[PDB]
């Protein structure tokens, strides 16, 4: 069905880097964008960034300047987020969903909306804990 | 930026009540707003897209309205499975910003 | 040695006049000298140190503003005053805006206005000067003839590190045995200080001449600040916005460190952290060499059975080095080195190691020498003819003369009439050439200078065309002389 | 500012490369070529002026290359 | 660098003063006058070249003021 | 006896991971984060949008 | 109202990790593994080499240098379309009303 | 010049001047081929995706 | 004294990458090259590669084509070896000796001889085990 | 590429014996050879550099000789602390290759 | 590509046959003859141009054989 599956929870060291997967099912994998959103437990939600599956452009917010990398595998229909320079503030739950798609590439807002940010297709959640 | 203020921060009501939420934006976001529920530690669900439209599969007790900067979310009859943290969210101009959140408690 | 592969190296022949040879040496290159005896010395220049500078100027590069007062009187009665215009620490400007009953005053005119701002300074240019004393040149003079560990390695104690200052003199230096060498420097004919300004930014320094540095914008301040912050400028820095009619405002112009660097392009840079460590610039020695043995004549032609432990190793037009390892019972002797031609012996090369010598036992002694421009047999053994080596210096005679002419053109370039002093023992012709080029380059001194690469080559081609227009055989001292000196100067400058 | 008077033909040279190491010369030439490439109409105007005043060919070429170089 | 190409005749004007408010023009004129005052020999050389090539008086004055302005 | 290796020319090559990107009509010239490696080969062009 | 960001120019920069390398006199032109990132700035040059330097053959051998490029505050240049923009005009009448 | 099995003796200026991407002798963990306009070619049809 | 110190033994996953440090003491850190040598337990020694501290050029053997990376820190006088694409054959003891130095760069051989390969200054040894 | 054969692979001798090792190279390595001991699971030590020279701090019972391709390592008097694995090593041409090894056993 | 610059007159010969052993020369001649045989109209055009420009007979023959050989 309309479904995404994430990876299991991970614990990493401060200053390391972590990689979270996001596998898709139920549709044509290049018909939607993938977007990554964090949530600290003592906080609400917070947007991390954006990847397009078709082609592979990315972007991210200013709070993650140079700390985040997004790749994919079109054959497995999977999106990889890699967060670098981990500190204790990065301990959070991570999320990834689907945007309605300006056909070619990312970040559009004028085609009538994205349509969710991010709770229709999204998955089950990846807890990431930065500790010693 | 686009600071999005969500009000109030937490509410308590009894079963069957009508509850309204208000979100205010510092900029014009004319229709680009979304409303979400979040059950705690669970997999959450969209409620309202375009600040006026139901998602298919969402029951009809939810509604939303507002155009300029002030937006009103409304549950007509509060039900015991609707205890969740509710978020409003801008879509415009893309430093994409969420509301703070609104927790519910059943009386 | 300490001088191989550091190319643009200054070979010097001749010692005549008794012993004095005139050498001009600089930080970039080094000088190798030769004579019919008195073995070959190597003159490498290392760091200059100007010990005691004195601070003449502070330029502010970044500034900030505060307390921002402003005032306006009335339409044409009164020109405005403000009590914090009293300090010169504040920057102030009059302007004229407009005033009316909307503004409140009356009479509906274009009334004057002032604005004021306190001036605080960030990191600065700390420009200093040095007198033509309190400065020393350090010269390492090092001899040839053996001692492995490296025909390079200027680090290391084989050549003496002799200092010289203009408060000093004939510069007596001692070496192992033979090397009593007297050097008479003339440091006052060097960079010509009292026209120099060392210029220190946050980490770096530059050497720029004085009139430019005084003439530069980016506010003035003299050396006696400490309290003051009395910057007598600021029309070049902080700029005042005035929109169409109403209130005017202050604007910091920002850091000009990049614009500063773009200004001091075309100027030599210098590390200055520990007092001073001054670099690139030249000086002029006169060299006296009596006082010199050949590290013993006092020996024998050796027995035989040498052994190479190093390659053929050609450096830089002819200078080829060979490191041999003596095997046997030497009791240190000489090395029978020769550069021969083929059979029916016509021995023609030169050895620049003169009287090479083995040390105590097995130690890989090394020898440099110059073959002719073609085939050559470099031979070192004697009694069973022990060892020949074939070598082919590709070269030419005409190409060697043309490259020497290019070296002489580069000496007619960057280094001035000191390069007329770069030879020696010239008597009439060298001295009259130095005086003639002295007055000639003085006429082409300031005196048509200050121009860049492009404009110099353009003024060269226009003056060579107006010389080509050929009136009354002024075309020579015009066209050919001026075109040669302008083109061969313009394509070589801005290095 | 100190954007200009870029300490060029002052003298004071040495054997070693000074600050920008033959990059300022190509900087100057490439920026004036770029400015000619962006504004062709002034180049055409300078060519017309060179053809009108002067009128001996060498004078024409001289003042044309000068009016290409008169830009600040 | 961005020391030059100082966004001058691009267009885009308005009623109001733009950035330096008629200070850049006097900046340009005063620095070229200062550079002429520091280096008189090149001015004399330019005057001699103006007298030699051209030789009609207007052409002389034109190329003289140009060779004063050819400095970077 | 003793040579020293001066150069490697590739004769056959293969490609992978094949990323592409385009911004917008005349706002933006496109960027891509995997242009940072010189191991990737990259080219700008203009298409239509 | 709605601009779109087209370009970033760096104004101040700093350098770190500062690697450099040289081959040998005319065998080899030098390579360095941190030339792989375009984040590093790199340049080839030619210096000199001899046994003093240690190598051999006494030539003018090539050399590289490399530096990591980190950026300070920037120019954040933006463009706007000929929509998403409003002019505000106050039109006001005469005839009285002091203040 | 060594190919898969054979070798050839060619002079130096030609061999430096030849296309088919450059790489210097200090690769090992490099793969830093500073060329590739001579090799891999990019199709662009009439308007769309290249 | 004349001394080098390596890092402790590590165990990593197949396909991962491992980083081994080599800290120096007793001399001027840019007066010698650093060289890395492996040893499988059921095998003798095997040379991995070469780094120069002064400047930082590297090279390696053909058996490690594109799998190995060498960096340094001049301030701490330390050399880092990073082996990528780990497999079960990489389980070995790692070594970092020093060489007599052609002043400027690389693994020269004509200046007499390196002089050890690698047991005068070398250290205490880094055991690396690739396992699941 | 340049191979290096070490012979023999293992030896046993009594205390005080004279033992010799032979290493053969497929190329000319004229003096570039080194001899090392290795105590098992320990920190090992250089014995011979340049195939003829002792290191200072090594006792005088060790020696080495040979020029062209065949090289001989020699312990004059075998001592009980000299049980180790001994290696010969080329330095030339730089795909730097070790010998296989030579283990010792005390009788 | 390396389709051309086919290392021809570089020097470096020896007594022995080098790589293609007198097959590349006949390769070159046969392919240019084949290309002339396929496209006669360009040959006629080259002949007309040879008859028009030049007009001394040797010059005609020279530029005709050249314009047959100008094909890549
Ligand atoms: C450059 O000179 C120095 C000083 O002579 C050399 O350092 C010496 O090297 C020998 C080699 O066996 C040592 O015995 C000395 O103890 C060293 N002197 C010291 C450490 O002060 C250096 O080797 C030379 N450079 C080269 C490349 O040979
Ligand atoms: C410009 O208009 C404002 C707004 O009307 C004026 O402020 C008023 O001034 C009158 C004077 O008696 C007061 O009674 C009002 O209460 C003020 N309005 C406020 C405070 O909102 C202002 O005075 C006018 N400007 C001038 C120079 O008169
Ligand atoms: C100016 O501002 C400073 C703040 O640092 C403070 O001393 C005071 O507010 C002002 N000083 C004056 C007006 O002398
Ligand atoms: C390229 O794609 C493959 C699978 O599609 C993936 O394993 C690999 O990591 C990708 N390369 C990069 C550099 O991400
Ligand atoms: C740069 O140097 C710092 C130490 O100053 C080090 O921590 C960092 O890993 C280095 N970065 C790279 C890419 O080598």
How would you sum up this structure, described in words?
This is part of a larger assembly, with two copies of chain A (132 residues), two copies of chain B (107 residues), four copies of chain C and three copies of chain D (72 residues). Chain B is an all-beta fold and 107 residues long. In chain B, 0% of the residues lie in helices and 45% in strands. Chain B has strands at residues 4-7, 10-13, 19-25, 33-37, 45-49, 53-54, 62-65, 70-75, 85-90, 102-106. Chain B is globular, with a radius of gyration of 13 Å. Helix content of chain C is 15%, strand content 24%. Chain C has helices at 210-215, 257-263, 398-412, 428-443, 453-468, 476-490; strands at 11-12, 21-26, 30-33, 41-50, 54-55, 59-60, 63-66, 70-72, 90-96, 112-121, 124-125, 128-129, 135-143, 163-164, 172-173, 181-185, 196-200, 205-209, 239-241, 249-251, 268-270, 282-288, 321-323, 338-340, 350-351, 366-370, 375-379, 388-392. Chain D has 72 residues and is mainly alpha-helical. Chain D has helices spanning 24-38, 40-52, 57-69. Classes of the chains: A mainly beta (132), B mainly beta (107), C alpha+beta (495), D mainly alpha (72). Chains in contact: A-B, A-F, C-D, C-E, C-G, D-E, F-G, F-H, F-J, G-H, G-I, H-I, H-K, I-J. A molecule of 2 linked components (NAG-NAG) is lined by residues 149-150, 153, 156 of chain C. It is classed as virus. Keywords: antibody, neutralization, virus.
Number of domains of chain B: 1
- What share of the residues of chain B lie within helices? under 10%
Distance between the amino and carboxyl termini of chain B: 37 Å
- Main-sheet strand order of chain C equals 1-3-4-13-14
Note the beta-strand portion of chain B.
35-45%
- Overall shape of chain B: it is globular
The SS-based structural class of chain C is alpha+beta
Chain pair sharing the greatest interface: C-D, 47 and 30 residues
Terminal Cα separation of chain C, in Å? 27 Å
Provide the spatial order of strands within the biggest beta sheet of chain B: 2-10-9-4-5-6
